[PDB]
Amino acid sequence: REKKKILAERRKVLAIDHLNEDQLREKAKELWQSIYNLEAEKFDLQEKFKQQKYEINVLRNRINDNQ
């Protein structure tokens, strides 16, 4: 029984657990659209992280060799 845990799970109840079946139709759609868009942001953020490890490593080679 956590205060911040009980309140967190209530976000579903306040947003979903109360209304229409025809609105739940066009509401579960936009809930997946948000995941897909965030899953796309997460892919691009992972790819940029790969390129930075190369960018940083090349810098570590330059800073050393130029001393």
Using CB under 8 A as the binding rule, whether residue 52 contacts another protein is answered as yes
Per the CB < 8 A criterion, the answer to whether 24 and 16 are in contact is yes
How far apart are CB 35 and another protein at their closest, in Å? 5
Using CB under 8 A as the binding rule, whether residue 35 contacts another protein is answered as yes
**DSSP secondary structure letter of residue 53:** H
Using CB under 8 A as the binding rule, whether residue 32 contacts another protein is answered as yes
Binding-site residue total for another protein (CB under 8 A)? 44
Using CB under 8 A as the binding rule, whether residue 6 contacts another protein is answered as no
